[PDB]
Amino acid sequence: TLVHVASVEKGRSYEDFQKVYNAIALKLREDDEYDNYIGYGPVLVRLAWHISGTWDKHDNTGGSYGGTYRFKKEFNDPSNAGLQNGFKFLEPIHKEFPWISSGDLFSLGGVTAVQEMQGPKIPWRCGRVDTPEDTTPDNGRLPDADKDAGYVRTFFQRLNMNDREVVALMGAHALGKTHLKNSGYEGPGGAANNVFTNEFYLNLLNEDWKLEKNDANNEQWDSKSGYMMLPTDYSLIQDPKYLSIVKEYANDQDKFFKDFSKAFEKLLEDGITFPKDAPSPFIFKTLEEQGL
Ligand code: HEM
Ligand SMILES: C[C@@H]1C=C(N)NCC1
C-alpha cells in the first residue's frame, strides 16, 4: 500500500482557497450557456467523482491525490468521455492560480459546483500533490451502468462505501444529463437539472418507469415526464436494502444533504493521509453568502 501524505501548498491558507472557489463560482455563473443552459455544475461534480473513483482501497492506487486525470491515459478513458468539458472550464482557473495542485483543483471544482447549485456545504481539505505519469491508473476502474444492485454493492466496496454511502452518493444523478455520444445513454434524471435537491429519490419512487431501448441500443428506464434512470440507478429500488434508504432520502431533504456531504468528502479524500497537524477542513462561503 502506497502512502500519500497531504502537503499544504506552500504558505497557503483558507483565504487563498476561498479565492479559487470564488473564481470557479464566478465562471459557473458566467458560462451559463453550456449544455443547453444546464451550465457546468453537473459536469464538474462528475469530474470530481471520476478523478476520485479510480481509487482502490487494497493498494491505494488511483484516487484524487495525484491529479492523474491530466495525463492522456486517464483523460482518454472511455468512462471519462465528456469530462474534457470540465477540464477545459478549469484551465483558466488553473492559469490564474498556478500554485494549486491538479487534484486539489479538480476536487474543489466538485465542492464549488455542489454548493453553488444550492447543495449542502462540503468540507474540503487541501494538500493533494501531483504525481508522475506512471502513477496514472489504468482504464476500467469506474463503474458500468448496465448492471444490477449486486454489481453496484460490490463495486463500491472497493471505494470503502457502504449501502447508505452508495445511495447518498447516487443522489447526484439528479444533476445534468446523460449524453448519447458520451456514454450511450440519453436524458436527464429530473426537472431541476442544475439545482441540488433530493429529486433523484422522489423520481425513482414516484415516476412510472418503462424499460426502453435508446438510440444507442442500450436499455434505460424512461418516464413520460422525459426523465431517465440507468439500470444501476433503478437497481436502488429493486434491492430491498437500497429501497429503504431511497425512501428515507425521498422523505428527508436535510438527512440526504448531511449524508451526501459526508460521503462526498470521504470519496474526495480516499487514499490521503492527513498529518495530525494539518489544517482543519475548510468550509467555503458561497458567492451568495459573500454578497458577490
Ligand atoms: C454505479 C455508479 C455510477 C454509474 C454507473 C454512473 C454512470 C453515469 C453515466 C453513464 C452518466 C452519463 C455521462 C454522460 O453521458 O455524459 C453519468 C452522469 C453523471 N454522474 Fe454518474 N454514475 C455513477 C455514480 C455517480 C456518482 C457517485 C456521482 C457523484 C457523487 C455521479 C455524478 C454524476 C453527474 C453529476 C452526472 C451528470 C454529468 C453531466 O451532466 O455532464 N455519478 N453517470
Ligand atoms: C442526469 C443522469 C440521470 C440518471 N438517472 N443517471 C445518470 C445521470
Run of H or E residues at 43 = helix 41-52
Do 275 and 153 belong to one domain?
A: no
> Solving technique for this entry?
X-ray
Do 102 and 209 belong to one domain?
A: no
Looking at the CA of 190, which ligand is closest? 2
Do 103 and 229 belong to one domain?
A: no
Q: Which domain holds residue 21?
A: 1-142+264-292
**Ligand 2 pocket member 170 (CB < 6 A):** no
Do 116 and 176 belong to one domain?
A: no
CA of residue 255 relative to chain centroid, distance: 19
Domains: count for the chain = 2
204/197 Cα distance (integer angstroms): 14
Cell of 113: 459546483
3-class SS at 124? strand
Do 286 and 236 belong to one domain?
A: no
Task: Residue 209: give its domain's CATH number.
Answer: 1.10.420.10
Do 242 and 223 belong to one domain?
A: yes
Task: Residue 127: give its domain's CATH number.
Answer: 1.10.520.10
Do 217 and 138 belong to one domain?
A: no
Measured from the Cα of 173, ligand 2's closest atom is: 8
Ligand 1 center–CA 11 separation, angstroms:
35
Residue nearest to atom 5 of ligand 2 (CA): 229
Instruction: Write out 185-209 in H/E/C secondary structure.
Output: CCEECCCCCCCCCCHHHHHHHHCCC
Residue nearest to atom 6 of ligand 2 (CA): 173
Give rounded-to-5 percent helix, strand, coil for the chain: 50, 10, 40
82, 43 Cβ separation under 8 angstroms:
yes
Do 108 and 50 belong to one domain?
A: yes
197, 250 Cβ separation under 8 angstroms:
no
Query: What is the structure's resolution, reported in angstroms to one decimal?
Result: 1.5
Do 122 and 6 belong to one domain?
A: yes
Do 21 and 157 belong to one domain?
A: no
Do 15 and 136 belong to one domain?
A: yes
Could you give the count of Cα atoms lying within 13 Å of 59 in the half-sphere of its Cβ? 5
116/25 Cα distance (integer angstroms): 7
- Candidates 164, 151, 159; CA nearest to 51 is 159
Instruction: Write out 220-276 in H/E/C secondary structure.
Output: EEECCCCCEECHHHHHHHHCHHHHHHHHHHHCCHHHHHHHHHHHHHHHHHCCEECCC
Do 270 and 247 belong to one domain?
A: no
**Ligand 2 pocket member 122 (CB < 6 A):** no
Ligand 2 center–CA 2 separation, angstroms:
34
236, 153 Cβ separation under 8 angstroms:
no
Measured from the Cα of 200, ligand 2's closest atom is: 5
**Ligand 2 pocket member 125 (CB < 6 A):** no
Substitution site in 46, 230, 236 for ligand 2 pocket (most atoms within 8 Å of beta carbon):
230
Determine how β-strand 177-178 pairs with β-strand 4-5: unpaired
